[PDB]
């Protein structure tokens, strides 16, 4: 049998991201829209920060700005919660401690409006130093690629995760961010609690010429593995 969710995420789907930011006061807000094709686990988006200069890391805002897009496996696909909770979506909340530095704590909702995949966030970011890492981008813009480790959450009826992200920091060093995830679904419906896994997940990150807004443009490849 297949689910509604499933048959949602056999094409390609339209994305559109909404964030809206506060760090250490500083206000910004953030436009992605794009294209995922979860039978490959490939992203295409474009992000815009619509306030004007991004006052941290495009690379730090990888991870928050669609896991639904992962390419499941089929030997996997009773795993998936992700595509699961569709159309109805989940909440996607996140702790992310940057070691000696300050954290974000985001909270999402990732669900379909007709036919486009929508995730809209809010970020409030707080104990930054003015002068460290990411208030004074001083990171790499290149490449973010790690495992995020899942694990279900019973009581919640949805699932755990925990990652760690290493920002290359521009002049040498690196700059760790620790990441800690809850996911709940947003409907009464039934869901797929999984087993414990990982998802392999590689970005490209890149910059359009034509473009003089402050933007990001990513590539990204998603695939769940034992
Ligand atoms: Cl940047």
Redesign the pocket.
């Given at each position: 049998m297949v689910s509604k969710g499933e048959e949602l995420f056999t094409g390609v789907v339209p994305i559109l991201v909404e964030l809206d930011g506060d760090v250490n006061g500083h206000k910004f807000s953030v436009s992605g829209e794009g294209e995922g094709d979860a039978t490959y686990g490939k992203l295409t988006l474009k992000f815009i920060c619509t306030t004007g200069k991004?006052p941290v890391?495009?690379?730090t805002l990888v991870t928050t700005l669609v896991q639904c897009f992962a390419r499941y496996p089929d030997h996997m696909k009773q795993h998936d919660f992700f595509k699961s909770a569709m159309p109805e979506g989940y909440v996607q909340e996140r702790t992310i401690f940057f070691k000696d530095d300050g954290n974000y704590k985001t909270r999402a909702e990732v669900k379909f409006e007709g036919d486009t995949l929508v995730n809209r966030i809010e970020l409030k970011g707080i104990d930054f130093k003015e002068d460290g890492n990411i208030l004074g981008?001083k990171?790499e813009?290149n490449y973010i690629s790690d495992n995020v480790y899942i694990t279900a959450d019973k009581q919640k009826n949805g699932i755990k995760a925990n990652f760690k992200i290493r920002h290359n920091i521009e002049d040498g060093g690196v700059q760790l961010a620790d990441h800690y995830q809850q996911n709940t679904p947003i409907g009464d419906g039934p869901v797929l609690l999984p087993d414990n896994h990982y998802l392999s997940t590689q970005s490209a990150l890149s910059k359009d010429p034509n473009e003089k807004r402050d933007h990001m443009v990513l590539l990204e490849f998603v695939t769940a593995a034992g």
């Open positions: 991004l890391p495009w690379p981008h990171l813009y």
